[PDB]
Amino acid sequence: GAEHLLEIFYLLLAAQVMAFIFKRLNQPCVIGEVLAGVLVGPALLGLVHEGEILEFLAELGAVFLLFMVGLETRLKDILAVGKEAFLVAVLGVALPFLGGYLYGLEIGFETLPALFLGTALVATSVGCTARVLQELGVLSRPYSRIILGAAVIDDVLGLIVLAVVNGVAETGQVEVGAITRLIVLSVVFVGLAVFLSTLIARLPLERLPVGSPLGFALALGVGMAALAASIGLAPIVGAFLGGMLLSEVREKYRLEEPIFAIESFLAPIFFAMVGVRLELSALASPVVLVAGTVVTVIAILGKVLGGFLGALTQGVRSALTVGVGMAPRGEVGLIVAALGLKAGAVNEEEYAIVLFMVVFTTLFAPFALKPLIAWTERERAAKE
């Protein structure tokens, strides 16, 4: 009711104000839209509290947020690259996950809670890294295609891991059987989506008893997510594949703009509500600060070697650009933390740590990647 209408108004308003601040600070994405949630949240103001309704508008936020990403993914542009991206993607999953789990047990975690920190480090922000390259306008360059190409695959792998970890979360001590079934269910469904998505362009929706091409995209997006839930996979990342289907007809039917108008509404709520859950005790906690800073460096170095050994193919100057470029975590890492806390496998202390590092990784991207792209362009300006 009007209880929540108010609450939403304070969420949107605070997010707008915090957004104007951070764009003026030249820190593009997924920072102020959280701290705005902290601000308007219980911890500081308390104009908004977490209700079941505002928890759902946070789901649609994450759903539409990854639906937008799945809509902007071209499977022509990626295939010309991804062989070298799939080398980075596998390293992108492998290196930081161990960094989370191994280091996690040393901070006194259990079996399950340790896996969640790893999965939180597995993810990569595909949204923020693209934003950085857009202003530079350098994205057309190949070393940018690898980073984004890997980031797409990596986020899909971050789902399957998270899905398995949650399968072990729901039911403890789960045998490898239920795990292996998710891996098969995931791979086939994705491959079927990829397979179907390639067959979409040849099939216009005109025969479908549909009232308009926008409506069908939505109805398909929510349906693809709901079906993913019935299979026992995260609905958030079940919509991303529903957008891969429509990514080829993206321009033809005029989708990208309106679907972004919806997403630009709901996506703020998701990032705020994640900030709402943060605590005063959580922020500035003596052990969290140390281990939070440490695990952050573990995340970077893991990505450096992962973005080097995997990107080693193209060049030295390029390999470094990929190592730093895969640094940001952002959206999915929150969908991990957000998922883990609600299942009850994530402690308030852990949630602080995850929200601590994602902030500092996103802070690190423009302060680092920006001069490197310049230096790579210089070396290529000589040898061309």
Place this chain on the structure above:
Amino acid sequence: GAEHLLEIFYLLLAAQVMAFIFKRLNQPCVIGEVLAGVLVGPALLGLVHEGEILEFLAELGAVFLLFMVGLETRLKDILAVGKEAFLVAVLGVALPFLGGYLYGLEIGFETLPALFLGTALVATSVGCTARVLQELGVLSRPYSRIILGAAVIDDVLGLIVLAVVNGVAETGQVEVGAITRLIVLSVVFVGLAVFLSTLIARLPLERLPVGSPLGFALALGVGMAALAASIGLAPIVGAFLGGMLLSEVREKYRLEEPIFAIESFLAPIFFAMVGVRLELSALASPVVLVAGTVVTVIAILGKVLGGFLGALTQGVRSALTVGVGMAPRGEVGLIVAALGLKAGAVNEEEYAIVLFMVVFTTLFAPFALKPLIAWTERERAAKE
């Protein structure tokens, strides 16, 4: 959760299918988007049931639906007319309200429930009537401006009535004092909005600590609705005035399209959920059919004289065009019925009647108004 994601998917899907059907039947608006709700609803299929979440997504639907209308209202175009529209608007409120209340007591209603049927007959669909004139492309003609101009004012008056009726609904036997306060609160707030809205064009949002002109429109829209609720006025119609503010800067900042992309998402849910609440007993009820058909004719004739005596100024040929043009009820009439049922002042039998006539009035508009506009154009083609 995935319970509702599913439910939403069946709502959107059914609405899309029912929309393709009705557009093919040449019955433009707010018919299949309800019966789709009946279809997927308990009464027939039962894939969707009414939860608290899907009741809220029905509110945002009605909110964004009237926010869209308030955004498309120009206060330059209206002022050149409205003197003759305000003659129709007052008749538009006066005639059918008595038709509801007087006739209502004869069907065995009480004091309060009788007022709701009247208020349900007070409203006019501004959305459907505009749609009809768009295809004909005749809307630029003046006799179309009166109908729409009156329809805008009428819907604002339909709010204040409904607000008073609800004030008497919440607390029984309410003294004229609390009623008179709402009338003052309503008139001033609207006049202030109208006053402010005229002062908006001179003031671009550029100085506001805002991240983007879309975000501010939303945050303002929800805020204007939430503030309306705290005053004890329907939030649904508190957003309409928040869009009047932005109606002058409508084109400048590129709002109309994206805000319609959101509304084209949420607005279906509102019309479906209204259909969901309908009953098998409600549909095809022996007394409902009679009184439902009767009160429908009472609604038309009330609008005929109201759209004649008020529109009598321009011409005979035009006066008839207005009488029929004000026939459709649509959106707000549901917001009445929907409001009345939840407060508990509306019986299942009454809800049937209101949803019965709005269907038959909307059905009546194209089957009637269409040839009349032609005949008015012919008489004007001779005398020009």
